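Hi team,

As requested, here is the filled-out complex form for the adenosine-5'-diphosphate run. I kept the field names the same as last time so the parser does not choke. Let me know if anything looks off before we queue the next batch.

— J.
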Amino acid sequence: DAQEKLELAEKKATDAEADVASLNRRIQLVEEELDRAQERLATALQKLEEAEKAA
Amino acid sequence: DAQEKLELAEKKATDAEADVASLNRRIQLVEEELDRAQERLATALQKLEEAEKAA
Amino acid sequence: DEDETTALVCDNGSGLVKAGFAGDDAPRAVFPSIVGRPRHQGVMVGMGQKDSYVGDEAQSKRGILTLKYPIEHGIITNWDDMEKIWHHTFYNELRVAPEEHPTLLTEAPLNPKANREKMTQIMFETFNVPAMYVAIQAVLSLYASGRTTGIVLDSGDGVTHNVPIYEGYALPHAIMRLDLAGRDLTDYLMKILTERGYSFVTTAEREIVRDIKEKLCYVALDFENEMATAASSSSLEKSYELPDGQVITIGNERFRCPETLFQPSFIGMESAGIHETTYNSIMKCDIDIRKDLYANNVMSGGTTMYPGIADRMQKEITALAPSTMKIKIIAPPERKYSVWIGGSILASLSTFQQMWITKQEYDEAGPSIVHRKCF
Amino acid sequence: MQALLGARAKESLDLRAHLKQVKKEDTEKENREVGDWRKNIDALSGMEGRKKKFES
Ligand SMILES: Nc1ncnc2c1ncn2[C@@H]1O[C@H](COP(=O)(O)OP(=O)(O)O)[C@@H](O)[C@H]1O
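And here is what came back:
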């Protein structure tokens, strides 16, 4: 029972960790898309400056 | 050892789950920031289109 | 399912395939012109795994696939693979079966006849499209640009077309179709990077080089001054991240590869380059039509995104051109996508609804009808 | 004496306005494919244990 609870707790940890990792992958994918959105925003804003400058 | 590993596996599971929860928050926060960044990007680009159009 | 039975529009190049519906300002999706096939023996069972992959599937699963391109220098050489691409492009991704919508495809005006005939045949016989019309790519570039007069130089992956159009009319005796294109620039870059110590020969390696080109390369309006420094100092090099974490830097090679559009001898081609062909498309037209073509050099297609290409294409023409005359390059944001956009514009014109081959006329005449009805 | 410069400047403007109006009418009439999509994620927050497969 300690061992089964352990396999279950270890599984919970494995799955929770699988999700710590899946979440970190999504966080980094989203943070990267965010940083990229912000890089692309800074670019869009710089290109906006070029467009307004063009205006 | 099974019981100690259980307390530690459950702790690890708790910590891993706590990390999933902290990370679920990091996702919701970054996810929303990305949707917002995409909107900011779209906004800068729409302004670019209007500024370029003005040009 | 759609609000109206407007045409589906799809520009099938040697590089990319793009599609969406007539009336919008963008394709819904872009795919590489690829059908992929496993080059390895499978060992695990119940792994899914297709016998062949199409478009983005082929590129996404490329780690174990050999990837083939059905289109070369503007024409389809493998129609079976294009059939797979069109099914995926129109039905799996735009979610519209061609059976219920007219389809507008495209080809250059001096594109070999077999290709405009095969596109007409497949959409009518395998997709049962109710109507067809294969667009002139130069026309679509002009529609997207908002021009009726100019030289359309479409520098795509396949072929550079170089066609003078005046007031909506072609001047065919002055078309300089040239077998110099973006695909050659990619292979040249694989070879020059090999010289730098970063060999590229396989499909995965070619896709990396195409990605390097698309993010790092440029033309340089004044390449002699640019290479004098770029070939002398690391301050002109730019780093690229490869899929496995490796970093490659490129110096004068960064613009020397695109330079081939002006210097075709770099790839063993006998040609004057794109600026001289623009010049001759203008110069071979009557003098009352050149004064408008000089002022309207119309840039279209891909490769047009390299910084310095517009200025490099205007400076060289100006140098070849007579003095007094104003030489002007038109290089809109609707670049690379201008043919698709023009396709949407053509498809929605009320006057264009009389230009369609119906799936009646098609069967009575056969696919040769494309030359009676389209161009 | 100025009748022709008026007419010629106008002809140029009418053609340019026509050509731009044609591409602008499609730009404004339909605009969905020119936009973007959510592109959401899985996360698997409901994964409280192992699956029924022999592989899990
Ligand atoms: N960022 C970029 N920089 C330089 N060249 C580009 C870029 N994007 C696209 N091109 C190039 O343009 C070519 C695509 O040809 P294209 O004109 O789009 O055919 P099509 O008319 O069917 O759309 C490819 O060789 C591609 O590498």
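Two things worth flagging: Chain B touches chain A at residues 2-3, 5-6, 9-10, 12-13, 16-17, 19-20, 23-24, 26-27, 30-31, 33-34, 37-38, 40-41, 44-45, 47-49, 51-52, 54-55 (CB under 8 Å). Residues C 11, 13, 15-16, 18, 156-157, 182-183, 210, 213-214, 301-303, 305-306, 336, 339 surround adenosine-5'-diphosphate (CB under 6 Å).

Thanks,
J.
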